[PDB]
């Protein structure tokens, strides 16, 4: 009822600001489609029911919402279950559509993302090129150098994604040292089946 | 009438999103609870609300709401009137259910917490274990030396509590430095009395 | 119509906290006697309202608003207009009640306050003591030497005031630094008649 | 619809926001009239908006919705468009009328603009005088040197422009350090056309 309505006049007003600016149909369609993978049809102030609780609830639930996501992903099924809810607590959705760029080689990092459901290509100017998919995760070599982005990332199917900020990412690894090191030895694993090659790894 | 009718549309959206997410039923029925414990069937923008008066009835209305826990908690009770009000405007209300773990030894801590009504379990792996209730305070020995909590504390009851972020903690202790001394004389017995002995203290 | 439906809406929000609270009866009037007077049966949400508008209408309006303030006080009446409008921008309305001590001797000074309309008493331990009234400002040697408060400043009557932050003050004072010199002159005065002497100034 | 009857809503909090403080009938008018040329009938959470949304799609939002902008102003019609995109996301639609001073000279600039429709007159004490016009921006200089601001500029007509930050002019030219040398070179340029000159660029 609440949220289903929330969700119908929140969609009326994109609707409404689209036809203010103009936008294209094919656009309009392209934001009607993002629109329903995202929130699926239902709307929440999130930040607003979760501050309403404490911090037992909220890890409780973040928790219940990603066992999926930590029981196919070894980095998380296998760490100390801490560790893998102080990520969880900074993880945010998002939904990406086939074709976009998620992340652009040369550019600088400002985020890392898991693939809840999708796969994506890795993609770099000397056509070295890999795919990713459920369970596994890209954007952390730029996070551990702050870098730039060693390669592009494009979403060949509709993406379900989480993301953690550099900041959190840094925050979390603060914490628990210990896996930082499983990052690198991936990344360096990742970064020498393509060519390069960092002394900060 | 408003209140209430805010809590429970407020509640409804809390019941939507655990539907949306498809949440157990005992883990609803723990939110329930949850929510009844803590807000009691009226909900308050108390931000907003205090944020409309002024300095002076703000810190009346503060110090009426915690007589009990200023008369009965010595440390707060004996001080100064200023450094008191100073505390009492930083607190914020938290409610935990029994099980919850309120601090995890070897974390690093953020907050220390004032027992208005309930019993916690103070647990270190060196089986060494003690009571707190009201008019106690716990979590304050990392604040003091921003190392890491040297025990867990869990509810045993359901806790009413106010915690105090290690900010506002340093905040108040600047204006106040004679009340930093109450604080370490106290911690310094606890450690004693489980093995412990900090320099730093 | 709707500014003061927003004024009886939030009194009634007001109305149930104190219930909620259990606040005695004779605070619950001094809190209505407060909302009289501080917003006068119409609220609005200002933040919102100016930031609807740019630069030059927001400064044209609280120009328009502050003119008495402005010309009764030789500070602000002489002065460049674009130090007084600067002044004017950073400034928040506040009512006090008789009996109210806006500021405490011997502790920190975050702002300081002009009197629009009302008196005020300073209060020093030495018993030298003054009255300010229309036109005059006060909590400023504070901000100046970054020390503790002078003296105590008690309203005598119910007192309109614009207060500016410490951060504003040195902001304002940083484009114009003219005007540090005019404050510290009036705060020198002001010391010797109370036996006080800053180097400082 | 809804953002239409937005609009006429928070029109009539403007309107008992002026009756309340008494602004004169001239100004009044003035403030209608802004509101119609800045809002043009419809309201929108806008913040709201686009935070829904993901990268990907504010991009290409703000894209086509300065396609006129890019297009007619040689710097960003020949720029790399991830340069483009990236000053496109930070500016902030600012709507000023005639005879508004946008910048004064001597003060300190925070900000700089860019003209989609109306002319302004850049004015300096001593007297030599130019037009700015479609295409053109203006307030770089200041942003470049740290320094204060080299001339006045003020509205003819009504001007629709866009503002960037100085954080934000500054988080882009890291990225993109080429461009602060086209910035720099029609900065020299325009100081060397009124008698100045600075050994910073
Ligand atoms: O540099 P980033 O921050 O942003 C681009 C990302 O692409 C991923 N990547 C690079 N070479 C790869 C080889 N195989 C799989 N994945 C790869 C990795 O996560 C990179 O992190
Ligand atoms: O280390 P913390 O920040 O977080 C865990 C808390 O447990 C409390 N504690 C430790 N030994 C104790 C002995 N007796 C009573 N209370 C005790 C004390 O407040 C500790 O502060
Ligand atoms: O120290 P503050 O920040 O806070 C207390 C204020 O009291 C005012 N004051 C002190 N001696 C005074 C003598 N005469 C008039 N006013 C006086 C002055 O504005 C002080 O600034
Ligand atoms: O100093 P600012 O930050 O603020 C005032 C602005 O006026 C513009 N300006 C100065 N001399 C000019 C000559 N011709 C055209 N435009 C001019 C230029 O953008 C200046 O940048």
């Known amino acids: 009822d609440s949220s289903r309505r929330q969700y119908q006049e929140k969609y009326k007003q994109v609707e409404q600001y689209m036809s203010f ?15 329903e993978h995202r ?22 639930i973040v928790n219940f ?3 999926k ?9 296998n760490a100390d279950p801490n560790f893998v809810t102080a990520m969880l607590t900074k993880l945010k959705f998002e939904v990406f559509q086939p074709g976009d760029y998620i992340i652009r080689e040369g550019t600088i990092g400002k985020k890392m993302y898991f693939i809840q459901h999708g796969v994506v290509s890795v993609l770099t ?6 795919k990713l998919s459920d369970g596994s995760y890209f954007g952390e070599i730029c996070l551990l150098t702050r870098g730039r982005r060693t390669a592009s990332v494009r979403a060949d199917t509709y993406c379900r994604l989480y993301s953690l900020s550099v ?9 628990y040292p210990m896996m930082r090191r ?3 030895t991936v990344a360096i694993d990742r970064l020498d089946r393509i060519g390069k090659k960092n002394s900060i790894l």
């Not at 600016?21 to 629109?35: E, S, T, V």
């Not at 100017?125 to 890999?130: A, L, S, Y």
């Not at 900041?167 to 914490?175: K, Q, R, S, T």
């Open 21 to 35: 600016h103009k936008l294209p149909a094919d656009f309009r369609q392209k934001i009607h489609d993002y629109y």
């Open 39 to 60: 929130y699926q049809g239902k709307m929440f102030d999130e930040d607003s029911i979760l501050g309403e609780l404490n911090g037992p609830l909220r890890e409780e």
């Open 65 to 67: 919402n990603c066992r």
């Open 69 to 77: 996501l930590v029981a196919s992903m070894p980095l998380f099924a």
């Open 125 to 130: 100017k000397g056509n070295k090129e890999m």
């Open 167 to 175: 900041d959190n990412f840094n925050e979390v690894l603060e914490e």
């Open 182 to 184: 499983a990052f690198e």
